[PDB]
Design a protein around this ligand. Sequence first.
Ligand code: HEC
Ligand code: HEC
Ligand code: HEC
Ligand code: HEC
Ligand SMILES: [Ca+2]
Ligand SMILES: [Ca+2]
Lengths: 323, 323
Amino acid sequence: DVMKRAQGLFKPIPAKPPVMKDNPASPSRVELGRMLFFDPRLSASHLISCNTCHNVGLGGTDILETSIGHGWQKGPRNSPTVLNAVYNIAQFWDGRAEDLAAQAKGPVQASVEMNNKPENLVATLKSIPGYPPLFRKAFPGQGDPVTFDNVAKAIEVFEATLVTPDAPFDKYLKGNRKAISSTAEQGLALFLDKGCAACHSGVNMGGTGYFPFGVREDPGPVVRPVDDTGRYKVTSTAADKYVFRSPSLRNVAITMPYFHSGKVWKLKDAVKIMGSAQLGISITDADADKIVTFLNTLTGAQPKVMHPVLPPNSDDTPRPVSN
Amino acid sequence: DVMKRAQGLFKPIPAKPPVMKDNPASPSRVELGRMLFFDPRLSASHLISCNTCHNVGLGGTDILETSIGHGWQKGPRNSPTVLNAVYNIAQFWDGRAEDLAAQAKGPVQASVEMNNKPENLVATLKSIPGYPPLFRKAFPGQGDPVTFDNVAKAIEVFEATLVTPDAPFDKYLKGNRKAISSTAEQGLALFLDKGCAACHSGVNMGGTGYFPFGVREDPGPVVRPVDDTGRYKVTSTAADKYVFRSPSLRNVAITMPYFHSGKVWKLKDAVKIMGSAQLGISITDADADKIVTFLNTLTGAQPKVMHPVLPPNSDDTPRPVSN
Ligand code: HEC
Ligand code: HEC
Ligand code: HEC
Ligand code: HEC
Ligand SMILES: [Ca+2]
Ligand SMILES: [Ca+2]
């Protein structure tokens, strides 16, 4: 039976946030991470926060082809969702960061994203009187707790709470056959039988390893821009050219556009391109429609996040830098 | 007694949101307005929402000298707080919009702010399947409820909930003498005795009328940029040159920088400039410090807003425009 086959390849998202080794999630550290995720003072301009590009109301992404950051500069890649990102084997589309705490240091410093630097960020947080007390509560064994590393750890334990349990497919995996429609179940059988679960398996429906984008056919220079060689830039290993981490397909129906280039807006087109590029098949329009109906059952409960009330500047807070 | 004098000039913010005539606040219409306030699809770029420039975590402002909108374009004016704006006599620093619903049509259309147009906004909301149902619930007697006017009305009844009761000064006005410090009470006596309450009175501590910025002395061409003649641009009446609405001073300690130009970062400097420019006095540093201690008692309870979960695009949703 397709339910039993699925139960051998995928797992539901747990209700409880996962534990980060060597980063305990106290109430104070998670609260601090939620404040920092929404605080645009993490950026040089004081205008961009993590929620700008990973909007918790829009599936943890920004619904753009590629992100726009400091100075209205467009980046090379589509912003992947923060939802469930804690269950991926590594972070970024090329897997270059080992975990969420390592990842968070990237956007802060990237000139086309937040355009900040660690020293300015620490000075800024130290100048906001309400922040050092919260760092002391969250990192109480440190003489100097307001550090870049601690910013990254706080944001990690907050992001570990941004999981989306209870999608209809997870209720199916727990044994409720009626939680998805017959057409969704036929999409699930097509997903399994065409081979998609090789690269999109486990608790996260993906995020499990590194694969060429174009195992069987080049997706072409729009969907796969030639200069973006993926993990090759990370490892300098020729076998990594055009290799990317598979994405988690959880919440894919609400995180358009698709692929690391953001050039494919319709989920049905992304499914057909995956069949061609990865599997050398031409998926029919009727089969692609059933697979999309199945992928729509992977949208989980969206987190319900209170927007933080952030502590005010002092007169010594650094002034925004917008150039 | 200074408490009795204050009770004759100011009033505390009511706990209940005020009623908007001809815009009833049903649960559905207020919920819709909260979704729209946080939805960056109100902008051409799909990246800017009202919360970008009126951040509910940062006192309802953006803590910049002047706002930056579409294309990284800097505007001429500092963003005033949305908190308590429902109690001002008119909206914008020049009072050119009669109420919050009229005001909301401005940022949507301004090329240096959201850079949208009404027809594109309506088409975009109609293309997001979850939005027309919510407009029907909020505006049930209309055959075509997804309109620009209705967007503005929904956002108005949401903004009428963004009031900040329970500041320490309001507890003092209700008869608790100990709710503010002796030094704050001395600041209050100085505020009254120097004449500041003529222009900063009532329920909102301001927002009550139109006054020259520079009754007694020109603040100079940095703090009062010469090309920004305030209400003169609205009325073409020469007596309105450099006339601006007085701001509400509620939450002023957390809404820096100050004045419509955003050029004065320190509240103590703004107090001294008000004494010179408006009253022809040189406030001493000790008196300015007591007045700032009093203004700090005007920070009320900050609203606790759940970030909305916004309905996803369809494949017919217009794609972002970033140029
Ligand atoms: C827009 C200008 C961004 C801002 C601000 C932040 N992020 Fe981001 N994020 C962005 C892009 C374009 C990408 C992909 C880049 C690449 O080279 O692959 C990312 C990636 C992430 C991830 C990885 C998720 C995954 O691999 O599945 C995470 C967890 C993430 N971003 C988190 C994050 C945080 C915490 C931020 C504030 C400190 C932040 N991002 C800002 C775009 C932008
Ligand atoms: C491994 C060899 C894969 C197989 C087989 C399939 N997919 Fe895949 N998928 C894979 C990668 C490495 C990526 C990212 C490629 C990139 O550079 O962007 C993807 C991406 C998708 C997406 C887009 C998701 C998103 O952008 O967030 C979808 C919708 C998707 N894959 C679906 C899918 C289906 C339905 C498949 C069977 C027909 C399939 N994939 C096979 C790796 C692999
Ligand atoms: C930044 C790019 C802005 C965006 C996006 C929005 N607003 Fe704004 N707002 C901005 C400025 C610079 C100003 C002052 C302009 C002037 O000419 O005076 C405003 C003003 C307001 C007000 C008036 C408050 C008062 O007079 O006390 C309100 C109520 C307001 N803005 C609300 C608002 C809403 C609801 C928005 C989304 C539709 C919105 N603003 C976007 C800067 C920017
Ligand atoms: C009317 C004649 C006024 C008197 C007397 C005082 N103020 Fe005022 N104030 C007034 C206006 C019209 C404005 C806005 C001017 C502009 O173009 O920007 C202000 C502004 C302030 C501010 C800044 C608040 C903010 O930017 O949100 C403060 C802190 C302020 N006023 C304080 C203040 C004090 C302490 C006064 C007595 C010494 C005083 N004001 C008098 C109009 C008038
Ligand atoms: Ca995407
Ligand atoms: Ca201000």
